[model samples]
Target: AGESITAVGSTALQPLVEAAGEQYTGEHLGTFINVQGGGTGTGLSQIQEGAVQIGNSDLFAGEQKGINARQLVDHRVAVVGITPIVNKKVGVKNLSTNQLIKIFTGQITNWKEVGGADQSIVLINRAQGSGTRATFEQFGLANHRSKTAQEQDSSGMVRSIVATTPGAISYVAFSYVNKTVQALSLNHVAPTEVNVTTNDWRIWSYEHLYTKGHPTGLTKAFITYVQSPAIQNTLVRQLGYLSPDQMLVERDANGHITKT
Candidate 1:
């Protein structure tokens, strides 16, 4: 409860970090937090550059290419599933992985390729350097960023844009899914907590709160609070994230999956 702390990056983890900041501030005087979202790259880059006290990213610090991979400590505060989201009017609920590749790579433009309505697919992509976008393309689109319909920079903005545009499709953190957009199932497997825990839902990543080095003082305190049982059980779930404790398996930034 002392110094000012700024955390930037990872729009997917934006809501969770911002919420925790609010709770932290409410309980402590003289401590203030500014939580901002740019993307995973911004978070990692800024932290490496000492531009911010913390970087909240959907990616591991090692993944942002071209940035100096400085010594940074990762506090994996939460686990989140990433799922394909479509405009509610698209009339498609499930897609096989192969179908996803075809749809994203411009091989299939019409929803009927995946048994949806007879409408052309409009891909709303997150801009380059986005961790959510990178994770989606890596897992769902298989490391291939297909030709795009358009690119937006924010997950919150992407959700809004996709929801309002008919035949639109994109992917987002599971926490971003709401009543306006429909979350699609991949290969007939639902993106459920148990599915992610058991590794059935494959498109998921850990939420990282990164610091320039091992955290100290207020930064450490906040990271500890984020990983605490109270926040993990209540705020994390309330915001659609899985507790680290909920994970039955573990994976790292490079995505080597192993049973925990």
Candidate 2:
């Protein structure tokens, strides 16, 4: 039997999976669990080619282009809430849906147009293949394509840039938000886990751990371990993720929401 397994992909879910990997390895002596972040597309492609034991992703296999959804088995472990964050200097705490659309689409170039500072708005977008970007566009931008702004591949780097650069704005998983930047409220609705439970905070995605066909041996064991009550009840919440079972509403792969 294999004693090690590797998971790669989805920086949005990277924090959760990395923590769970450590805990799983700790409990099972001599076992190795390797986790990497290269975005969701990287994970899906690697897993499909059987290059890794597990593929961690924020988007469903079907949502990712060029992946054969039927060949992958999805193991959804947690829910990640995505939020728009801006530099503290922006001086804006909330934006109406229309205002956000205008800003991201280049229609509103300055913060003052949205009732903020008179500074120019600097947009920081995630790379093209990022699931975080996919979810943000789907929900926050109302499927509107963003103007060609600076694009970053790493979520941590994106946060750092946003924190230091005046008027810079970007989006990240809830786990990545901190005091250095301001997490925005949309249309007066605060970005909180309580709102995400009901889909009121619509910018969210399921954290999926995928395997080619079905997993076996060490890979299966670790996947099952991460979903156990031990991890779900403590590590999941502690890492700023919501266990799949905690949701009060359900969202499909296509982003349709309904009461659970």
lDDT values of the candidates? 0.89, 0.91
Best by lDDT: 2
Candidate 2 lDDT, 16-47, residue by residue in tens: 88898888888888888889999998999999
> Would you list the clashing residue pairs of candidate 1?
none
Which predicted model would earn the best TM-score?
Answer: 2
Looking at candidate 2, the ten consecutive residues that score lowest on lDDT are 251-260
TM-score of each: 0.96, 0.97
lDDT of 2: 0.91
RMSD of 1: 1.5
- Compared with the true structure, what per-residue lDDT tens digits does model 1 show for residues 68-178? 666888788998899999999888999999999988899999997777899989988888889988888887877877785798889988999989998999889998899
Off by over 4 Å in 2: none
* Candidate 2 vs. true structure, TM-score: 0.97
